[PDB]
Short mmCIF file of all heavy atoms in Angstrom, two decimals:
data_model
loop_
_atom_site.label_atom_id
_atom_site.label_comp_id
_atom_site.label_asym_id
_atom_site.label_seq_id
_atom_site.Cartn_x
_atom_site.Cartn_y
_atom_site.Cartn_z
N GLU A 1 -59.18 -7.23 -156.59
CA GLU A 1 -59.58 -8.61 -156.62
C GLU A 1 -60.94 -8.77 -157.27
O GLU A 1 -61.21 -9.78 -157.96
CB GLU A 1 -59.62 -9.21 -155.21
CG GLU A 1 -59.67 -10.74 -155.18
CD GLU A 1 -60.00 -11.29 -153.81
OE1 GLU A 1 -59.22 -11.04 -152.87
OE2 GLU A 1 -61.03 -11.98 -153.68
N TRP A 2 -61.82 -7.79 -157.05
CA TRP A 2 -63.15 -7.81 -157.62
C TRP A 2 -63.04 -7.68 -159.13
O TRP A 2 -63.75 -8.36 -159.89
CB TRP A 2 -63.99 -6.67 -157.05
CG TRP A 2 -65.33 -6.52 -157.67
CD1 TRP A 2 -66.41 -7.34 -157.49
CD2 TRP A 2 -65.75 -5.47 -158.57
NE1 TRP A 2 -67.47 -6.87 -158.23
CE2 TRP A 2 -67.09 -5.74 -158.90
CE3 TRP A 2 -65.10 -4.37 -159.12
CZ2 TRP A 2 -67.81 -4.93 -159.75
CZ3 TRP A 2 -65.81 -3.55 -159.97
CH2 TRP A 2 -67.17 -3.84 -160.29
N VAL A 3 -62.12 -6.83 -159.59
CA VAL A 3 -61.88 -6.62 -161.00
C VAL A 3 -61.30 -7.88 -161.65
O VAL A 3 -61.63 -8.22 -162.79
CB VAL A 3 -60.90 -5.46 -161.21
CG1 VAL A 3 -60.40 -5.44 -162.67
CG2 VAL A 3 -61.57 -4.13 -160.89
N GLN A 4 -60.46 -8.58 -160.88
CA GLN A 4 -59.83 -9.81 -161.39
C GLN A 4 -60.82 -10.95 -161.48
O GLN A 4 -60.66 -11.87 -162.30
CB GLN A 4 -58.66 -10.19 -160.50
CG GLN A 4 -57.41 -9.36 -160.69
CD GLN A 4 -56.39 -9.58 -159.62
OE1 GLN A 4 -55.72 -10.62 -159.58
NE2 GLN A 4 -56.23 -8.60 -158.73
N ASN A 5 -61.83 -10.92 -160.61
CA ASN A 5 -62.85 -11.98 -160.59
C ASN A 5 -63.89 -11.85 -161.67
O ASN A 5 -64.29 -12.84 -162.29
CB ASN A 5 -63.52 -12.02 -159.21
CG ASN A 5 -62.65 -12.59 -158.13
OD1 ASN A 5 -62.64 -12.14 -156.98
ND2 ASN A 5 -61.89 -13.64 -158.48
N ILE A 6 -64.34 -10.62 -161.89
CA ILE A 6 -65.36 -10.37 -162.91
C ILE A 6 -64.76 -10.42 -164.32
O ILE A 6 -65.45 -10.66 -165.31
CB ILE A 6 -66.05 -9.01 -162.70
CG1 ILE A 6 -65.05 -7.86 -162.73
CG2 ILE A 6 -66.80 -9.02 -161.38
CD1 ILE A 6 -65.67 -6.52 -162.43
N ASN A 7 -63.46 -10.17 -164.41
CA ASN A 7 -62.75 -10.17 -165.69
C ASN A 7 -62.34 -11.59 -166.06
O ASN A 7 -62.34 -11.95 -167.24
CB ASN A 7 -61.51 -9.29 -165.63
CG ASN A 7 -61.85 -7.82 -165.66
OD1 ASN A 7 -63.01 -7.43 -165.83
ND2 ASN A 7 -60.83 -6.97 -165.50
N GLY A 8 -62.01 -12.40 -165.07
CA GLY A 8 -61.58 -13.77 -165.30
C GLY A 8 -60.08 -13.86 -165.46
O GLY A 8 -59.54 -14.94 -165.73
N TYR A 9 -59.40 -12.73 -165.31
CA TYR A 9 -57.95 -12.66 -165.45
C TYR A 9 -57.32 -12.22 -164.14
O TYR A 9 -57.88 -11.41 -163.41
CB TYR A 9 -57.59 -11.66 -166.54
CG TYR A 9 -56.26 -11.92 -167.20
CD1 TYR A 9 -56.07 -13.05 -168.03
CD2 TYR A 9 -55.19 -11.09 -167.02
CE1 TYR A 9 -54.86 -13.30 -168.63
CE2 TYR A 9 -53.96 -11.32 -167.63
CZ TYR A 9 -53.80 -12.43 -168.42
OH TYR A 9 -52.59 -12.68 -169.03
N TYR A 10 -56.14 -12.79 -163.82
CA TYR A 10 -55.46 -12.46 -162.57
C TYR A 10 -54.09 -11.85 -162.78
O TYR A 10 -53.36 -12.24 -163.70
CB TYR A 10 -55.41 -13.68 -161.65
CG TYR A 10 -56.77 -14.18 -161.27
CD1 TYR A 10 -57.46 -15.07 -162.09
CD2 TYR A 10 -57.37 -13.77 -160.09
CE1 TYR A 10 -58.72 -15.53 -161.74
CE2 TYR A 10 -58.63 -14.22 -159.73
CZ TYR A 10 -59.30 -15.11 -160.56
OH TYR A 10 -60.55 -15.57 -160.20
N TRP A 11 -53.72 -10.91 -161.92
CA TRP A 11 -52.44 -10.22 -162.01
C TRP A 11 -51.35 -10.85 -161.14
O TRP A 11 -51.51 -11.99 -160.68
CB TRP A 11 -52.59 -8.74 -161.65
CG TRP A 11 -53.78 -8.09 -162.28
CD1 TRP A 11 -54.38 -8.41 -163.43
CD2 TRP A 11 -54.52 -6.98 -161.72
NE1 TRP A 11 -55.45 -7.58 -163.68
CE2 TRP A 11 -55.56 -6.68 -162.63
CE3 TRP A 11 -54.41 -6.21 -160.56
CZ2 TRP A 11 -56.48 -5.67 -162.42
CZ3 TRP A 11 -55.32 -5.19 -160.35
CH2 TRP A 11 -56.34 -4.93 -161.29
N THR A 12 -50.26 -10.14 -160.93
CA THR A 12 -49.15 -10.62 -160.12
C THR A 12 -48.93 -9.74 -158.90
O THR A 12 -49.68 -8.80 -158.66
CB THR A 12 -47.85 -10.64 -160.94
OG1 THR A 12 -47.51 -9.34 -161.38
CG2 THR A 12 -48.00 -11.56 -162.15
N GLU A 13 -47.91 -10.05 -158.11
CA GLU A 13 -47.60 -9.27 -156.90
C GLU A 13 -47.14 -7.88 -157.23
O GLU A 13 -47.54 -6.90 -156.59
CB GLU A 13 -46.56 -10.00 -156.07
CG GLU A 13 -47.10 -11.09 -155.15
CD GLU A 13 -47.33 -10.59 -153.74
OE1 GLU A 13 -47.29 -9.36 -153.52
OE2 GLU A 13 -47.54 -11.44 -152.84
N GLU A 14 -46.28 -7.74 -158.25
CA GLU A 14 -45.70 -6.44 -158.60
C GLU A 14 -46.77 -5.48 -159.07
O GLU A 14 -46.76 -4.29 -158.68
CB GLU A 14 -44.59 -6.62 -159.64
CG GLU A 14 -43.41 -7.45 -159.20
CD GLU A 14 -43.70 -8.93 -159.16
OE1 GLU A 14 -44.39 -9.43 -160.07
OE2 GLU A 14 -43.25 -9.62 -158.21
N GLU A 15 -47.68 -5.93 -159.92
CA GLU A 15 -48.74 -5.06 -160.44
C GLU A 15 -49.63 -4.55 -159.32
O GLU A 15 -49.96 -3.38 -159.24
CB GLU A 15 -49.55 -5.78 -161.51
CG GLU A 15 -48.85 -5.92 -162.85
CD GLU A 15 -49.47 -6.99 -163.72
OE1 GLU A 15 -50.61 -7.38 -163.47
OE2 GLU A 15 -48.78 -7.44 -164.67
N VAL A 16 -50.04 -5.47 -158.42
CA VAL A 16 -50.89 -5.09 -157.30
C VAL A 16 -50.14 -4.10 -156.40
O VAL A 16 -50.73 -3.09 -155.98
CB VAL A 16 -51.33 -6.34 -156.51
CG1 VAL A 16 -52.01 -5.93 -155.22
CG2 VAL A 16 -52.23 -7.20 -157.36
N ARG A 17 -48.88 -4.35 -156.14
CA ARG A 17 -48.07 -3.49 -155.29
C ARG A 17 -47.93 -2.08 -155.87
O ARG A 17 -48.03 -1.09 -155.15
CB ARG A 17 -46.69 -4.09 -155.06
CG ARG A 17 -46.06 -3.68 -153.72
CD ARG A 17 -44.57 -3.37 -153.89
NE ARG A 17 -44.15 -2.27 -153.09
CZ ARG A 17 -43.54 -2.38 -151.90
NH1 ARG A 17 -43.31 -3.57 -151.39
NH2 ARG A 17 -43.19 -1.28 -151.23
N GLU A 18 -47.72 -2.02 -157.17
CA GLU A 18 -47.55 -0.77 -157.89
C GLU A 18 -48.85 0.06 -157.92
O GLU A 18 -48.83 1.25 -157.66
CB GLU A 18 -47.08 -1.01 -159.34
CG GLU A 18 -47.58 -0.01 -160.35
CD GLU A 18 -47.72 -0.61 -161.72
OE1 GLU A 18 -47.73 -1.87 -161.84
OE2 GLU A 18 -47.85 0.15 -162.71
N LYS A 19 -49.96 -0.61 -158.23
CA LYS A 19 -51.26 0.08 -158.27
C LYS A 19 -51.67 0.55 -156.88
O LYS A 19 -52.17 1.67 -156.72
CB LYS A 19 -52.31 -0.85 -158.84
CG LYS A 19 -52.09 -1.19 -160.31
CD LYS A 19 -53.18 -2.12 -160.84
CE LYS A 19 -53.42 -1.91 -162.32
NZ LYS A 19 -53.40 -3.18 -163.08
N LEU A 20 -51.45 -0.28 -155.85
CA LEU A 20 -51.79 0.12 -154.50
C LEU A 20 -50.96 1.32 -154.05
O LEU A 20 -51.48 2.27 -153.44
CB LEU A 20 -51.59 -1.04 -153.53
CG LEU A 20 -51.77 -0.78 -152.05
CD1 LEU A 20 -53.24 -0.51 -151.76
CD2 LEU A 20 -51.24 -1.90 -151.20
N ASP A 21 -49.65 1.31 -154.34
CA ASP A 21 -48.80 2.41 -153.97
C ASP A 21 -49.26 3.70 -154.64
O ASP A 21 -49.37 4.75 -153.99
CB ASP A 21 -47.35 2.11 -154.33
CG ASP A 21 -46.35 2.89 -153.51
OD1 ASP A 21 -46.65 4.05 -153.18
OD2 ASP A 21 -45.27 2.35 -153.20
N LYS A 22 -49.57 3.61 -155.93
CA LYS A 22 -50.02 4.75 -156.70
C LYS A 22 -51.32 5.35 -156.16
O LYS A 22 -51.45 6.56 -156.03
CB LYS A 22 -50.21 4.37 -158.16
CG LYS A 22 -48.99 4.53 -159.03
CD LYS A 22 -49.26 4.26 -160.49
CE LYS A 22 -50.02 5.43 -161.13
NZ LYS A 22 -50.58 5.06 -162.46
N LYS A 23 -52.29 4.50 -155.84
CA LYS A 23 -53.56 4.94 -155.33
C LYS A 23 -53.45 5.54 -153.95
O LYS A 23 -53.99 6.63 -153.67
CB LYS A 23 -54.56 3.75 -155.29
CG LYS A 23 -55.32 3.54 -156.58
CD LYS A 23 -56.74 3.04 -156.31
CE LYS A 23 -57.49 2.78 -157.61
NZ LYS A 23 -58.09 4.05 -158.13
N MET A 24 -52.71 4.88 -153.06
CA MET A 24 -52.57 5.40 -151.70
C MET A 24 -51.81 6.71 -151.67
O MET A 24 -52.19 7.63 -150.94
CB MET A 24 -51.86 4.35 -150.82
CG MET A 24 -52.64 3.05 -150.66
SD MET A 24 -54.31 3.27 -150.06
CE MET A 24 -54.02 4.08 -148.50
N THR A 25 -50.75 6.83 -152.47
CA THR A 25 -50.00 8.09 -152.52
C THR A 25 -50.88 9.21 -153.01
O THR A 25 -50.91 10.32 -152.45
CB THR A 25 -48.76 7.92 -153.40
OG1 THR A 25 -47.93 6.88 -152.86
CG2 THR A 25 -47.97 9.22 -153.44
N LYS A 26 -51.63 8.98 -154.10
CA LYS A 26 -52.50 10.02 -154.64
C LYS A 26 -53.55 10.46 -153.60
O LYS A 26 -53.76 11.67 -153.39
CB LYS A 26 -53.18 9.54 -155.91
CG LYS A 26 -54.00 10.61 -156.62
CD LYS A 26 -54.97 9.97 -157.61
CE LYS A 26 -54.36 9.83 -158.97
NZ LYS A 26 -55.39 9.81 -160.06
N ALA A 27 -54.20 9.48 -152.96
CA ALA A 27 -55.24 9.84 -151.98
C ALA A 27 -54.65 10.59 -150.80
O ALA A 27 -55.22 11.60 -150.36
CB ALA A 27 -55.95 8.56 -151.50
N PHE A 28 -53.50 10.13 -150.27
CA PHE A 28 -52.92 10.81 -149.12
C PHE A 28 -52.51 12.23 -149.48
O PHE A 28 -52.72 13.15 -148.67
CB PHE A 28 -51.72 10.02 -148.61
CG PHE A 28 -51.04 10.66 -147.41
CD1 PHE A 28 -51.45 10.38 -146.15
CD2 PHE A 28 -50.01 11.58 -147.60
CE1 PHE A 28 -50.85 10.97 -145.05
CE2 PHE A 28 -49.41 12.19 -146.52
CZ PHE A 28 -49.83 11.89 -145.25
N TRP A 29 -51.93 12.43 -150.65
CA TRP A 29 -51.48 13.78 -150.98
C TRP A 29 -52.67 14.70 -151.26
O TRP A 29 -52.63 15.88 -150.93
CB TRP A 29 -50.53 13.74 -152.19
CG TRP A 29 -49.13 13.44 -151.79
CD1 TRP A 29 -48.34 12.42 -152.21
CD2 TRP A 29 -48.34 14.19 -150.84
NE1 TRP A 29 -47.11 12.48 -151.61
CE2 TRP A 29 -47.07 13.56 -150.78
CE3 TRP A 29 -48.56 15.33 -150.06
CZ2 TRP A 29 -46.05 14.03 -149.93
CZ3 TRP A 29 -47.55 15.79 -149.24
CH2 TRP A 29 -46.33 15.13 -149.19
N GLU A 30 -53.75 14.15 -151.82
CA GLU A 30 -54.96 14.94 -152.00
C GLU A 30 -55.50 15.40 -150.64
O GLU A 30 -55.79 16.58 -150.44
CB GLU A 30 -56.01 14.12 -152.74
CG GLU A 30 -55.94 14.21 -154.24
CD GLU A 30 -57.15 13.63 -154.93
OE1 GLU A 30 -58.00 13.04 -154.23
OE2 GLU A 30 -57.26 13.76 -156.16
N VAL A 31 -55.57 14.49 -149.67
CA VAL A 31 -56.08 14.86 -148.36
C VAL A 31 -55.15 15.86 -147.66
O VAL A 31 -55.60 16.80 -147.02
CB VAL A 31 -56.28 13.58 -147.49
CG1 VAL A 31 -56.60 13.95 -146.07
CG2 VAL A 31 -57.39 12.73 -148.08
N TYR A 32 -53.83 15.63 -147.80
CA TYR A 32 -52.87 16.53 -147.14
C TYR A 32 -52.97 17.95 -147.70
O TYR A 32 -53.09 18.91 -146.94
CB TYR A 32 -51.44 15.97 -147.32
CG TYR A 32 -50.42 16.66 -146.46
CD1 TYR A 32 -50.10 16.17 -145.20
CD2 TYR A 32 -49.76 17.82 -146.91
CE1 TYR A 32 -49.16 16.79 -144.41
CE2 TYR A 32 -48.84 18.44 -146.11
CZ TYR A 32 -48.54 17.93 -144.85
OH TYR A 32 -47.59 18.56 -144.06
N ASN A 33 -52.92 18.08 -149.02
CA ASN A 33 -53.07 19.41 -149.63
C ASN A 33 -54.42 20.00 -149.32
O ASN A 33 -54.53 21.23 -149.16
CB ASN A 33 -52.86 19.32 -151.14
CG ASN A 33 -51.43 18.95 -151.52
OD1 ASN A 33 -50.47 19.41 -150.87
ND2 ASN A 33 -51.27 18.11 -152.52
N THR A 34 -55.43 19.17 -149.16
CA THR A 34 -56.77 19.67 -148.82
C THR A 34 -56.77 20.32 -147.43
O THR A 34 -57.33 21.41 -147.27
CB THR A 34 -57.81 18.56 -148.88
OG1 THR A 34 -57.83 18.01 -150.23
CG2 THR A 34 -59.19 19.08 -148.55
N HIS A 35 -56.16 19.65 -146.45
CA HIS A 35 -56.11 20.15 -145.09
C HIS A 35 -55.17 21.34 -144.93
O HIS A 35 -55.36 22.18 -144.04
CB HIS A 35 -55.73 19.00 -144.13
CG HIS A 35 -54.43 19.20 -143.41
ND1 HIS A 35 -54.32 19.61 -142.11
CD2 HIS A 35 -53.16 19.01 -143.86
CE1 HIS A 35 -53.07 19.68 -141.77
NE2 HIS A 35 -52.33 19.31 -142.81
N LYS A 36 -54.17 21.43 -145.77
CA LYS A 36 -53.21 22.52 -145.77
C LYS A 36 -53.81 23.79 -146.38
O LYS A 36 -53.64 24.90 -145.86
CB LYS A 36 -51.92 22.13 -146.50
CG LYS A 36 -51.04 21.18 -145.70
CD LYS A 36 -50.50 21.86 -144.45
CE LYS A 36 -49.41 22.87 -144.81
NZ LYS A 36 -48.80 23.46 -143.58
N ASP A 37 -54.51 23.63 -147.52
CA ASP A 37 -55.10 24.80 -148.20
C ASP A 37 -56.17 25.45 -147.35
O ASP A 37 -56.25 26.67 -147.22
CB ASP A 37 -55.65 24.37 -149.55
CG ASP A 37 -54.56 23.97 -150.53
OD1 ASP A 37 -53.37 24.01 -150.14
OD2 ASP A 37 -54.89 23.60 -151.68
N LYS A 38 -57.04 24.62 -146.73
CA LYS A 38 -58.18 25.14 -145.98
C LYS A 38 -57.86 25.36 -144.50
O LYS A 38 -58.71 25.92 -143.77
CB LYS A 38 -59.37 24.20 -146.11
CG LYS A 38 -59.89 24.06 -147.53
CD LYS A 38 -61.27 23.44 -147.55
CE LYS A 38 -61.89 23.51 -148.94
NZ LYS A 38 -63.38 23.51 -148.88
N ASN A 39 -56.69 24.93 -144.04
CA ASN A 39 -56.28 25.05 -142.63
C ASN A 39 -57.34 24.38 -141.73
O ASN A 39 -57.95 25.01 -140.85
CB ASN A 39 -56.07 26.50 -142.24
CG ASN A 39 -55.40 26.63 -140.88
OD1 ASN A 39 -54.24 26.22 -140.69
ND2 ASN A 39 -56.09 27.22 -139.93
N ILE A 40 -57.54 23.09 -141.94
CA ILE A 40 -58.51 22.30 -141.19
C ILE A 40 -57.86 20.99 -140.74
O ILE A 40 -56.73 20.69 -141.10
CB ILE A 40 -59.77 22.00 -142.03
CG1 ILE A 40 -59.38 21.37 -143.39
CG2 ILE A 40 -60.57 23.26 -142.26
CD1 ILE A 40 -60.57 20.89 -144.16
N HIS A 41 -58.59 20.25 -139.92
CA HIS A 41 -58.10 18.96 -139.42
C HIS A 41 -58.00 17.96 -140.57
O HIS A 41 -58.70 18.09 -141.57
CB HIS A 41 -59.02 18.44 -138.31
CG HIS A 41 -58.46 17.28 -137.57
ND1 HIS A 41 -58.68 15.98 -137.95
CD2 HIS A 41 -57.69 17.20 -136.45
CE1 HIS A 41 -58.10 15.16 -137.11
NE2 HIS A 41 -57.48 15.89 -136.19
N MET A 42 -57.00 17.15 -140.57
CA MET A 42 -56.82 16.10 -141.61
C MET A 42 -58.13 15.37 -141.88
O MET A 42 -58.54 15.23 -143.04
CB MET A 42 -55.74 15.12 -141.16
CG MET A 42 -54.33 15.58 -141.44
SD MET A 42 -54.01 15.58 -143.20
CE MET A 42 -53.30 13.96 -143.42
N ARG A 43 -58.75 14.86 -140.82
CA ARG A 43 -60.00 14.11 -140.90
C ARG A 43 -61.03 14.85 -141.74
O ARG A 43 -61.65 14.29 -142.64
CB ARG A 43 -60.55 13.86 -139.49
CG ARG A 43 -61.99 13.31 -139.48
CD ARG A 43 -62.25 12.45 -138.25
NE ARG A 43 -61.80 11.08 -138.43
CZ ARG A 43 -60.68 10.59 -137.90
NH1 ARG A 43 -59.91 11.35 -137.16
NH2 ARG A 43 -60.35 9.32 -138.12
N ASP A 44 -61.21 16.15 -141.45
CA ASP A 44 -62.14 16.96 -142.22
C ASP A 44 -61.76 17.04 -143.68
O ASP A 44 -62.61 16.85 -144.55
CB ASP A 44 -62.21 18.36 -141.62
CG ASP A 44 -62.86 18.38 -140.25
OD1 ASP A 44 -62.82 17.37 -139.55
OD2 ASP A 44 -63.43 19.44 -139.89
N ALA A 45 -60.45 17.26 -143.97
CA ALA A 45 -60.03 17.41 -145.35
C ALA A 45 -60.36 16.17 -146.19
O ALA A 45 -60.91 16.29 -147.29
CB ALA A 45 -58.54 17.70 -145.41
N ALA A 46 -60.04 14.99 -145.65
CA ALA A 46 -60.40 13.76 -146.33
C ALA A 46 -61.90 13.71 -146.61
O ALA A 46 -62.32 13.36 -147.72
CB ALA A 46 -59.97 12.54 -145.50
#
């Protein structure tokens, strides 16, 4: 929303949904693999 406000252009529901899914999946998998590789608590890995 901040990007849409400073740009002056607005997106749609599908684009927001797609970008959010992509970002959340990437972050979650990064944290998961982090906690698995180091054998630590999820919280710590993030």
Side-chain angles (χ1 to χ4, degrees):
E1 196 193 299
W2 175 73
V3 166
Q4 284 168 73
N5 285 142
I6 59 184
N7 286 354
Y9 206 70
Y10 298 85
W11 316 331
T12 62
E13 276 264 13
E14 298 75 41
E15 284 161 20
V16 172
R17 209 221 142 98
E18 148 210 15
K19 294 180 151 130
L20 175 70
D21 203 325
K22 271 185 76 192
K23 272 214 181 278
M24 297 306 301
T25 300
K26 186 198 270 206
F28 179 89
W29 276 123
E30 273 191 354
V31 171
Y32 192 93
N33 294 321
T34 300
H35 116 103
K36 285 294 286 184
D37 293 359
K38 297 195 171 207
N39 192 65
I40 53 173
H41 190 270
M42 278 291 267
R43 169 152 276 103
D44 292 27

